[PDB]
Amino acid sequence: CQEQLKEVNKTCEALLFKLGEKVKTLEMEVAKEKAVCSKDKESLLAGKRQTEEQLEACGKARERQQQEQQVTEENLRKVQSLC
Amino acid sequence: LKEVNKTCEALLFKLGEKVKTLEMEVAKEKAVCSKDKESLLAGKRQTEEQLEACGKARERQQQEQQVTEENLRKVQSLC
């Protein structure tokens, strides 16, 4: 009676741990993927925000060159009226 | 001792549910990650091409500044 109930249970527990290892494998796979994903997305977000700041600075340098161009063009119009 | 085998069998069912929940989470997270990084890459590549076009316009303006500045000098020099 003692050896029979122990043999029955050894079989159930051994299946329980075989499946227990699949749960552990899947829990680590989830943890790994979430860490690599979130790290890669934070990196891409930081990268596009850096390009947006460069695009902003480039746009601002184009505004300055256009102010300078208008000043030079106005100087032509004005000096041409004296020559 | 029938008691301990009942708890083992009840856990086999709970672990089947947990395995399926985890297999679905793996599949879903992989698919959501893939389309989020494709969206961020497309966003980053659209800004990089705008940065490139701005840079080309910025050099096209400095060359038009060289032309207009020398024409101003020519007109003032020969006034």
Author numbering:
A (entry chain C): 4 to 86
B (entry chain D): 8 to 86
Q: What are the paper's exact sentences on this?
A:
PLVAP CC1 crystallized in the I212121 space group with unit-cell parameters 33.8 Å, 89.0 Å, and 180.9 Å, referred to hereafter as crystal form II. X-ray diffraction data were collected and processed to 1.95 Å. Because PLVAP CC1 contains only one methionine, we initially produced PLVAP CC1 with selenium-labeled methionine (SeMet) for multi- or single-wavelength anomalous diffraction (MAD or SAD). However, the resulting anomalous signals were too weak to be useful for structure determination. The PLVAP CC1 dimer model from crystal form I was used to determine the structure of PLVAP CC1 in crystal form II by MR. The electron density for residues 141 to 145 of crystal form II chain B was not visible. Structure-based analysis by the Socket2 algorithm for both crystal forms shows that most of the PLVAP CC1 dimer exhibits a classical coiled-coil configuration characterized by heptad repeats (abcdefg in Fig. 6A). Among PLVAP CC1 dimers, the average rmsds are 1.15 Å for crystal form I chain A + B vs. chain C + D, 0.89 Å for crystal form I chain A + B vs. crystal form II chain A + B, and 0.84 Å for crystal form I chain C + D vs. crystal form II chain A + B. Conformational differences are greatest at the N terminus.
The microscopic openings across the walls of many capillaries contain a protein mesh that is formed by the extracellular domain (ECD) of plasmalemma vesicle-associated protein (PLVAP). Current evidence suggests that a single transmembrane protein, plasmalemma vesicle-associated protein (PLVAP or PV1), constitutes the diaphragm’s sole structural protein. PLVAP is a type II transmembrane protein of ~60 kDa with an ~390-amino acid C-terminal extracellular domain (ECD), a single transmembrane domain, and a 26-amino acid N-terminal cytoplasmic domain. The three-dimensional structure of PLVAP CC1 presented here shows that it forms a parallel disulfide-bonded dimeric coiled coil.
